[PDB]
Amino acid sequence: GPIKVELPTKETVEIGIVDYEAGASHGNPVVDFLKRNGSTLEQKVNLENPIPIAVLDSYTPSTNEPYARV
Amino acid sequence: PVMADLNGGLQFVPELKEFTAKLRKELVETSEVRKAVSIETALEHKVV
Numbered sequence: 001g002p003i004k005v006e007l008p009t010k011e012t013v014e015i016g017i018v019d020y021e022a023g024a025s026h027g028n029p030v031v032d033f034l035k036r037n038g039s040t041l042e043q044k045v046n047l048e049n050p051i052p053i054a055v056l057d058s059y060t061p062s063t064n065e066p067y068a069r070v
Numbered sequence: 071p072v073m074a075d076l077n078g079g080l081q082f083v084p085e086l087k088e089f090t091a092k093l094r095k096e097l098v099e100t101s102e103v104r105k106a107v108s109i110e111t112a113l114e115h116k117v118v
Contacts, residue, residue, distance in 0.1 A: 022118065029114040036113075 003016040020030045061067070075081075083089060 025118045027117040029117050032117050033110065033114065 001018045002014045003018055004012040005015045006012050018030060020028070080086070
């Protein structure tokens with residue numbers, strides 16, 4: 001994969017490529033190194049408290065044929 | 071009164087503080103770099 005560097009404008013630009021190839025192995029050393037030395041960026045950001053939206057009732061049809069046919 | 075200089079020519083080294091600090095940092099850096107690289111190579115071996 002690519003390696004990117006953050007800029008003063010917070011835009012990241014590619015500066016190199018990760019390139020690991022190995023035969024028989026018990027693990028991936030690249031991912032272990034990055035886990036132990038870096039931090040993982042997570043896109044999803046949790047609210048401090050979930051906001052309930054609704055609790056709804058639904059029913060399954062009495063025959064599965066129409067869904068199969070469509 | 072007699073004044074004996076038992077300094078072994080150290081007075082002829084200019085900017086002595088900076089020179090000795092440079093020597094010390096050279097050594098410390100070499101030691102730390104080597105230790106860190108060795109630890110990481112060992113861990114990579116242990117995972118692969």
